[PDB]
Design a protein around this ligand. Structure first.
Ligand SMILES: COc1ccc2nc(O[C@@H]3C[C@H]4C(=O)N[C@]5(C(=O)NS(=O)(=O)C6(C)CC6)C[C@H]5/C=C\CCCCC[C@H](NC(=O)OC5(C(F)(F)F)CCC5)C(=O)N4C3)c(C(F)(F)F)nc2c1
Ligand SMILES: [Zn+2]
Length: 198
């Protein structure tokens, strides 16, 4: 009944993939208790850094990537949810269920990737475990893993970036193409699709 209708919490930044040095590594910036409280209030006072955030809801954890001043992720992770910020919940700037794409204004302190114009097919996928996985581009929205691995290793990495050799953003990881549990290929949202949305 109406008086008891609940509101879904905000997406919460709980960590980041550190790409600022010679070694990629995951950092946690918020534990589970703080994540749950921050999801309910939508108020996150933590200082944000970097290009790839680790984000969570009460039910899911995945990634988000800043490109040209927008923090992007997948709709199948975030739905229509707000994201927590120092000033309270921030409403999505972009929502496109047909692309499996959402975006919010990039958090103050984040760094943005630049959309790739190289037209290169030698790509690199960054996972929530800070693995940098070579991927050969095979179409507008598909790439093959040079070294297949179980889907367990890719779970939770939707929203992460595919990068060109020069470190530009080429796309957003969306889904794993699996054969008997082994990911041989990935589906991604091309950065051009993000650029049209903007
Ligand atoms: C109403 O709006 C909606 C509602 C629901 C939707 N559910 C969608 O797909 C779902 C979720 C997505 C996924 O698991 N993503 C990744 C991830 O990590 N998620 S996550 O972070 O853990 C988490 C779930 C927390 C957020 C990186 C993957 C890593 C491992 C895979 C695990 C096994 C799953 C294999 C599957 N494989 C596949 O579908 O391959 C095919 C492809 F999609 F490529 F065509 C080939 C034929 C289908 C796959 O990958 N997913 C199934 C899509 C999408 F993504 F499909 F667009 N849109 C939606 C739009
Ligand atoms: Zn490039």
């Amino acid at each position: 009944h109406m008086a008891s209708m609940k509101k879904k919490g905000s997406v919460v930044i709980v960590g980041r993939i550190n790409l600022s040095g010679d070694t990629a590594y995951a950092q946690q910036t918020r534990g589970e208790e703080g994540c749950q409280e921050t999801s309910q209030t939508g108020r996150d006072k933590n200082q944000v850094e970097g290009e790839v955030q680790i984000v969570s809801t009460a039910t899911q954890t995945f990634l988000a990537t800043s490109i040209n001043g927008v923090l992007w992720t997948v709709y199948h992770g975030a739905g229509t949810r707000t994201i927590a910020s120092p000033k309270g919940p921030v409403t999505q700037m972009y929502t496109n269920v047909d692309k499996d794409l959402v975006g919010w204004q990039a958090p103050q302190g984040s760094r943005s990737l630049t959309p790739c114009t190289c037209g290169s097919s030698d790509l690199y996928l960054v996972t929530r475990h800070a693995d940098v996985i070579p991927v050969r581009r095979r179409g507008d929205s598909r790439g093959s893993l040079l070294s297949p691995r179980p889907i367990s290793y890719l779970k939770g990495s939707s929203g992460g970036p595919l990068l060109c050799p020069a470190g530009h953003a080429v796309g957003i990881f969306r889904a794993a193409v699996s054969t008997r549990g082994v990911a041989k290929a990935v589906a991604f949202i091309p950065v051009e699709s993000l650029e049209t949305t903007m």
